[PDB]
Amino acid sequence: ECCEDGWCCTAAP
Ligand SMILES: *[C@@H]1O[C@H](CO)[C@H](O)[C@H](O[C@@H]2O[C@H](CO)[C@H](O)[C@H](O)[C@H]2O)[C@H]1NC(C)=O
């Protein structure tokens, strides 16, 4: 879910 949904991954620490 999310990062496999393609619209979630990023830096954001
Ligand atoms: C993932 O992290 C990076 C920031 O170090 C990249 O530039 C981008 O940054 C975030 O996304 C928006 C920046 O325009 C938000 O405003 C957020 O505050 C910011 O940290 C991120 N990548 C993506 C694709 O969103």
Curated annotation (Swiss-Prot):
Origin: domain of life: Eukaryota
Residues linked to a glycan: T10
Modification 4-carboxyglutamate, positions: E1, E4
Cystine pairings recorded for this chain: C2-C8, C3-C9
PTM per Swiss-Prot/TrEMBL: O-glycan consists of the disaccharide Gal-GalNAc.
Expression by tissue: Expressed by the venom duct.
Residues modified as 6'-bromotryptophan: W7
Compartments where found: Secreted
Residue positions, PTM 4-hydroxyproline: P13
Record family assignment: Belongs to the conotoxin T superfamily.
The protein's role, per its UniProt record: Epsilon-conotoxins act at presynaptic membranes, blocking the calcium channels or G protein-coupled receptors. Causes hyperactivity upon intracranial injection into mice. Causes dorsal fins drooping in fish.
Domain comment, as recorded: The cysteine framework is V (CC-CC).
Name of the protein this chain belongs to: Epsilon-conotoxin TxVA
